[PDB]
Amino acid sequence: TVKDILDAIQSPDSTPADIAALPLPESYRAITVHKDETEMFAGLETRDKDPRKSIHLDDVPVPELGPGEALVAVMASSVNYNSVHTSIFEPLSTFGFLERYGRVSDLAKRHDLPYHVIGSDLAGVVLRTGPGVNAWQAGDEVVAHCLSVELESSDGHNDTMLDPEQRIWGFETNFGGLAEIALVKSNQLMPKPDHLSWEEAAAPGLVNSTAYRQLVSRNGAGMKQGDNVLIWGASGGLGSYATQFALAGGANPICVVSSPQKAEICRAMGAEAIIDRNAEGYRFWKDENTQDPKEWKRFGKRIRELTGGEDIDIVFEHPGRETFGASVFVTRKGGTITTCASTSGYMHEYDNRYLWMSLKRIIGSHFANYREAWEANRLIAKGRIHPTLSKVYSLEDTGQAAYDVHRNLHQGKVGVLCLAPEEGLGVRDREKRAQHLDAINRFR
Template sequence: MKEILDAILASDSTPADFAHLALPESYRAVTVHKDEVEMFDGLPTREKDPRKSLHLDEVPVPELGPGEALVAVMASSVNYNSVWTSIFEPLSTFGFLERYGRTSPLAKRHDLPYHVIGSDLAGVVLRTGPGVNAWRPGDEVVAHCLSVELESADGHDDTMLDPEQRIWGFETNFGGLAEIALVKSNQLMPKPKHLSWEEAAAPGLVNSTAYRQLVSRNGAGMKQGDNVLIWGASGGLGSYATQFALAGGATPICVVSSPQKAEICRSMGAEAVIDRTAEDYRFWKDENTQDPKEWKRFGKRIRELTGGEDVDIVFEHPGRETFGASVYVTRKGGTIVTCASTSGYMHSYDNRYLWMSLKRIIGSHFANYREAWEANRLIAKGKIHPTLSRTYSLEETGQAAYDVHRNLHQGKVGVLCLAPREGMGVRDRETREKHLPAINRFRNV
């Protein structure tokens, strides 16, 4: 690994230099273990501790197949799917790996007693398999996390509809929280030149997810002038949704849980901000009963901020805790678009407010190839910025996942893999200087 890192850090390394580097037999990777899937049985979700289940192991370099690439990972990041993997909720990811392993002899590589996790990376291509022409060793890349087979017609209009669609590093093995990752070559995209490794690694999953959910015609199809309610507006997903709303001429109504998070939203340019903790919204009377009076109080507060208008779009991802309120506050004919359920998957809402007011609920999951590419292009052009707040070492990934699990973070948290320190990998200083305050916005909190 030292020779690989030396080649990446050298200013004069050529594609031929990278192609002639010897691959190591093994590499360090953050894993969960199959024989530990029951370790948290009986504990409430909040008490399940990723620091106990995530391991830093030395694992063999996987076989490289057709249409694939091995990437030296300089930096990665923690997403909520890493938390789900680490606490074995709602299911152990080993079931995903077993099913994938049964699909072909090559896929069998993924069915192992350990799972290398992580769905983001920024790094350098080391090797490409047969049939790869768009990328070569030495290319600096980021990776989106959509893994598809595209053997069915279903996925050729929208790759997210492929029956064999999976999220790399969550439903596949050999993810990005490691020194080396195995990806399909069509996951690769150019690394934004004005960003450091850790900054470039942070947006991938959440930026693409927010783009499809809010901007794409496959999601809400946001337009200029829309009022957009954004739950968790300073978090990993919400911070990108807030930027897309502002960049697209919409008005974000940012819902956060502390004064510090409210200030982050205002620093991005949002004016309508609701601190739900300070205003003490309690949408549930008890575990089984919601409180419509609180929905109405929430709707009234939104109209105070919008000049009397209801929201056109709700950017939903908390799920159970907020979904009833989301359906209620959406305007007649409006859209609730949901991509996750971090507070619970069993949603409950009053259907009268949906059907009688002609509202729509749209499910949105990650992004197709084109959407991921467009979202990354906006990062590269300096239109949307990383929301990285803190970076951990590979050895500290368990703590990083714990902080995300307990909502102790702002924006995204990064993980240095091969990169020896922060701030490395910047190739375009001029563009960086133009956007430095925005790039560092979440770090300054």
């Protein structure tokens, strides 16, 4: 049973030899969305859709292990926006892709199923290794990157994010991490940091690695110490990791939040310059087809007062349409606007005179390649960047967890215990954990 696996992981006296020899259960507990139910939301608006009515907790058969892959006993995961989007079947259900992609080969076909096991983060222990897997073995304490790339095309051989056959694990693949067991490629695997618990270790993955590419990597903004970095939604999932990269890299974050409580979160992170966009009442759109340059100017005036007359070197974009005109306007001459999302709307509108005449640059970014994910996770291992857990749910209550994220109820990360019976487990370096406890817990 799975309980044998849980007890074997927990016990201090267990070997790599031991963990290999335990038999796989016939099925495991999984968070699921169903294919027969994809029409369930019938003429409802998006915000009017409830993940609690579409999410199931099923017993599901263990998948066949292929070459290059790994079966992992999952202690914890988190809720990501992609997970929520899949719950609602928005813009469409995830079964479309799983079906079309399943046609390519028999290995691809494993994913084409009446249910979809979701989740794109994980922290656990490797149970089985596939053939051709050498860097990892059973018993290894791991977290997982969510990029699944095949690399048959040559397009990704100078940055795997350009691979045309890429898949986001647990979104465009089945067997995601919101379950007691998961199937991932071994080149998704990263070592779990010693000083964190399972759910803390699971919390950064997708979001932190995305922030890393966007802001720190040379494929993104390429931040340098001293830069003024404008960070929209600074207390949210993405923003919370971005703010930390800015601070830890010796740059100056200009945190934009929507409340005094969110502002206090950024001050705790260490940010000095904070704009509450709700208190200042910036209306970058007059009506939703006309923008207000006056408001862009007013906002840039506020930034200049906080920086002592400096503009923004790098804007960390993600709200999109509502905000994107201001972002382009406020950036310094020669500076960079970096974007990984458009949550308020994907039809961006900006004045190009401010872009071309001031030699600025808009850089698109999406997730992270494995080297980038490694590096970001490594910075978590070193205690430079910290997990941003605000609330932990049990696997039982992922439905509620997904609703909570859907209505933006919590700051930072929302995490899910999977196999872990209680919070706070899986800490190996008690000394280092104590050195950073205050920071690890800032969101809680």
